Design a binder for this molecule. Sequence first.
Ligand SMILES: O=c1c(O[C@@H]2OC[C@H](O)[C@H](O)[C@H]2O)c(-c2ccc(O)c(O)c2)oc2cc(O)cc(O)c12
Ligand SMILES: O=c1ccn([C@@H]2O[C@H](COP(=O)(O)OP(=O)(O)O)[C@@H](O)[C@H]2O)c(=O)[nH]1
Length: 454
Amino acid sequence: SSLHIAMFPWFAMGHLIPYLHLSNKLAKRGHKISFFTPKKTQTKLEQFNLYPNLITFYPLNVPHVDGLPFGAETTSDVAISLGPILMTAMDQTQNQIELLLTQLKPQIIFFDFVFWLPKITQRLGIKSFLYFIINPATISYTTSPPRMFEAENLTEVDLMKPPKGYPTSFNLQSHEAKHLASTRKIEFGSGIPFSVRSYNCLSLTDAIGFKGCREIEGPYVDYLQEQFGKPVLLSGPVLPEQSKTALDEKWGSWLGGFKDGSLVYCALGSELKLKQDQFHELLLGLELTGFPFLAILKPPVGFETIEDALPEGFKERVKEKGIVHSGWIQQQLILEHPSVGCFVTHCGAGSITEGLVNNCQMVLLPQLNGDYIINARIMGRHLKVGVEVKKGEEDGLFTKESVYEAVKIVMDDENEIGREVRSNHTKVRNLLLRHDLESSCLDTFCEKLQELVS
Ligand SMILES: O=c1c(O[C@@H]2OC[C@H](O)[C@H](O)[C@H]2O)c(-c2ccc(O)c(O)c2)oc2cc(O)cc(O)c12
Ligand SMILES: O=c1ccn([C@@H]2O[C@H](COP(=O)(O)OP(=O)(O)O)[C@@H](O)[C@H]2O)c(=O)[nH]1
């Protein structure tokens, strides 16, 4: 029988988009989806609703919290340092969420971050499903019980090694362990420290799920199920669905002028802004390659236009071979264009999937975020599908030569490291796109959801 599922993702495009990709896959199997979205953001999400008779959007009014920019609805509307205030605002939708659940009466609600929800749903007879689109390797490393019981005795050197029982090995740099040790304590909404919030969600929810498949994410889901003693499900890799909007003719024509496989596409997601010096180093490193490039970047910290922050003489030298562009673009459609030979990525989980299912060589430029860093280590060292740009051990900074070097390695047909990462990326793409991989993941996923509501 068909399920009624409500979707309540975090107010971020990197959560909204994969929740909607999965919503379409569930609706294709006959399930009814009630999709909760910030009100103004709904207009930008309609292009991804392939089953409007089964997927209905329900608008949320994102309430004011002191400090929140006016009208802001997602992390693409605020600086990263303002994220905790946007999470207080999500916490404050509780009244309109409880009204929606009593009127719509779903059997299950998928959610991010709001650890007060499982108390409401248990009262209403609804099953709570904490659904992550980040890597279970990340949650396992930072938010498993052994990490939480050290409380404030958890140090940078503690975070240099994995928690007890962790299923794999990789190395963090000093500045990365420092980042994790400090940021985990910082309040993220309504006075709740960041890792405490996610631990509360894991502890109180009825069940847990992640984007991913057994072949890659399996060992981390098994570890988390052992630790938290409740079902931890896999949705499948959430392969991107096709939009109802074709590729903007402006980009289609410009991209079409380049030889197949010759262009370097660089994008660091929709949330972050580089500092000026690393913005300069990144763009000068792309220029040094001599390849055409498209860099989708916000103006660096302190600056309001790309043009004002470009290194001196950059546009005059680069001419028509390179564009640096600040607006939202159709990334998934650009990554499918045959001109693209290389993807320089911040290692967001959504961007990683979009690169893996395409042909582009992967250059890993993780920004300072636990999931980006752990994704970069798994992609660079475990799957070995990409080359990571070297950062200073203590300062976290890269040179333009290190950017140049990584792109040159993967783009050089005669470079054996480049051939190896191409060959490994091909193996991973063939797995993810295998004719029965995603469908059998979803088969299991839906059986376990049916068990959950029985
Ligand atoms: O990047 C992280 C992340 O997602 C990001 O968290 C930070 C910002 O809010 C981003 O928009 C969001 O995508 C989340 C997260 C996502 C969804 C949830 O339901 C949840 O409980 C936690 O946990 C993390 C835990 C870490 O130890 C390290 C991380 O790096 C993240
Ligand atoms: O200009 C942009 C920037 C991002 N994206 C999409 O936004 C999502 C970003 O999610 P990810 O986890 O990669 O990064 P984030 O933006 O959350 O840091 C992916 O689906 C990208 O294809 C897009 O379409 N256009």
